[PDB]
Amino acid sequence: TRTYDGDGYKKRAACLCFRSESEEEVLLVSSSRHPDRWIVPGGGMEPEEEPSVAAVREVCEEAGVKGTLGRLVGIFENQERKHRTYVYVLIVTEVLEDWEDSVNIGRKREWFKIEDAIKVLQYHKPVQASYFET
Numbered sequence: 001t002r003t004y005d006g007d008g009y010k011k012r013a014a015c016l017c018f019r020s021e022s023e024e025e026v027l028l029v030s031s032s033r034h035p036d037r038w039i040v041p042g043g044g045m046e047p048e049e050e051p052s053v054a055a056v057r058e059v060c061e062e063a064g065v066k067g068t069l070g071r072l073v074g075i076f077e078n079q080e081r082k083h084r085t086y087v088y089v090l091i092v093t094e095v096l097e098d099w100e101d102s103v104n105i106g107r108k109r110e111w112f113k114i115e116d117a118i119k120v121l122q123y124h125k126p127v128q129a130s131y132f133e134t
């Protein structure tokens with residue numbers, strides 16, 4: 001079930017999943033509706049679910065990775081689609097081979113240099129590109 005803040009924005013969480021503590025390469029996943037497009041993995045918080053817990057759950061489900069949770073980067077609103085996403089750094093320590101969204105919907109994942117992740121997110125997902133600004 002979807003959850004909302006008091007202003008009716010959907011509550012989401014996501015991680016910037018980095019290959020190493022250098023934070024130079026990040027894992028993107030394919031769009032569910034548009035396989036040829038890249039997104040930052042993330043999704044809806046469940047009722048009473050801590051944002052850090054939702055973030056780590058969604059990137060397990062969507063990207064098939066686990067790791068060491070880092071700092072909250074910020075909370076990012078998509079005015080058009082009415083959602084607010086808590087975005088965390090995650091340093092990846094496990095890459096799993098047959099993860100929920102690989103099996104269920106054929107979701108892909110790929111490592112991008114930060115500059116290239118910003119480039120592929122800008123057109124359809126400019127707020128996700130902005131996750132990388134700081």
Ligand SMILES: O=P(O)(O)O[C@H]1[C@H](OP(=O)(O)O)[C@@H](OP(=O)(O)O)[C@H](OP(=O)(O)OP(=O)(O)O)[C@@H](OP(=O)(O)O)[C@H]1OP(=O)(O)O
Pocket residue numbers: 002010012030031032033034039042043044045058078081083
């Ligand atoms: O409407 P669409 O363009 O098909 O977008 C979809 C909606 O996003 P949005 O329209 O709200 O921006 C949807 O969210 P809902 O609108 O609540 O269905 C959102 O799912 P999300 O990641 O928020 O949730 P979850 O991962 O928990 O399913 C979904 O993400 P996901 O299926 O998990 O990758 C978006 O699909 P996308 O992969 O970004 O192409």
Ligand SMILES: [Cl-]
Pocket residue numbers: 018019020021022023024025026
């Ligand atoms: Cl890295």
Ligand SMILES: [Cl-]
Pocket residue numbers: 078125126127128
């Ligand atoms: Cl967005």
Ligand SMILES: [F-]
Pocket residue numbers: 043044058061
């Ligand atoms: F989900």
Ligand SMILES: [Mg+2]
Pocket residue numbers: 042043044058061062
């Ligand atoms: Mg999801």
Ligand SMILES: [Mg+2]
Pocket residue numbers: 041042043044058062
């Ligand atoms: Mg999602």
Ligand SMILES: [Mg+2]
Pocket residue numbers: 043044058
């Ligand atoms: Mg979900």
